[PDB]
């Protein structure tokens, strides 16, 4: 069939890529000059750094997105980090496992598929289930920050549950060599080579459903027989016209309010400080942090290494964050240079357009595997795909 890809970002480049591997037309229209959205390489003094996530996975090898490139046909070199991941506290860095030692369990009854029927918030249902540890909140509001960029009280105890059972499930993180742009350029080879096309600097305008064709800006038409939007749910809305949208789902949508984070690019003189494995920072405003040149060192400019911090910005003012960012890094890592800083329920009714990207993340899913989720469920909704449900 006809498929129309709105949006050359992660998610609409790997539905592009699946399902012109499966034989279908398929055209993806983007808007600015550049594909890769928020998941590609920014090049900038000597330095590649990332458009938005940190040149890493966050189930590395194993989870969904590993998947999905693998059967895409994808050469992508993606490799787990040595321990899974550290803990920063009380001045110094260590093994996560080692953190059972502030401690006097639930992991094996998520282990079992077992999910808590609670319905309460995440940090209410771990002082319950384990007890108000300062140091075990702390950490999980790390964790919270970095993976979903909120507060442990706003995750309900099933998600973090769901995203406990993925991490037991698929492991720990993993650096992409290449950075972001390598899967990028893989799934842009693979649409080229399966009779695809990929057109830049075109702005869709309209998705209309009634004729189910897009317009773009500079009047161009396009028939399909499915649209994939990878725009967000609040923009599809607008290209298909809020008309076509039940009363309470307009609310919902018009209800949604993007969670705000701060990216921290730290350009630190001489060797790796920390290798392949993610550091989360407990106590602080920064959640955590990564070192992606530990695997591919082109990534950082020569003689340096590339440290990259995230922090959840909440409620927290810009500028103020932006300032306490650097001042933890420089306590932290005294010799390190800022480089740049970057600031980033009814379901989907309709079903000759479908969603995909971080608009559409399933519960469990963390970031860009929950991308990946996403866009298998949607391929098997448009039964034009099957997963096994080690992936689902
Ligand atoms: N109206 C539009 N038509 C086509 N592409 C768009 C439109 N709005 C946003 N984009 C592109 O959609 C992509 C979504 O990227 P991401 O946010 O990473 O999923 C980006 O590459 C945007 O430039």
Known sequence: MRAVVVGAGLGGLLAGAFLARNGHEIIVLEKSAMIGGRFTNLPYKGFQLSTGALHMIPHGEDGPLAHLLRILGAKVE??????????????????????????????????????????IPADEWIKEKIGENEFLLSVLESFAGWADSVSLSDLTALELAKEIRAALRWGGPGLIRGGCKAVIDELERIIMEN????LTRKEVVEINIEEKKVY???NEEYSFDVAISNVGVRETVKLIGRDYFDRDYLKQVDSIEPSEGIKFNLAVPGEPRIGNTIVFTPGLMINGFNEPS??????????????MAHMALKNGNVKKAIEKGWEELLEIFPEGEPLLAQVYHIEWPLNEVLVVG???????????????????????????????????
């Open 358 to 392: 971080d608009g559409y993340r399933p519960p469990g899913g963390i970031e860009v595997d929950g991308i990946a989720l996403g866009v298998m469920k949607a391929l098997e909704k448009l039964n034009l795909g099957s997963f096994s449900e080690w992936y689902l």
């Open 195 to 198: 009779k695809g096309k990929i």
């Open 216 to 218: 773009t800006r500079d």
């Open 294 to 307: 530990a695997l591919d060192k082109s990534l950082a400019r020569e003689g340096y290494t590339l440290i």
């Open 78 to 119: 993606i490799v787990n980090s040595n321990p899974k991941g550290k803990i920063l506290w009380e001045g110094k860095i260590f093994h996560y496992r080692e953190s059972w030692k502030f401690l006097s369990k639930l992991l094996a009854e998520i282990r079992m598929n077992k999910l808590p029927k609670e319905e």
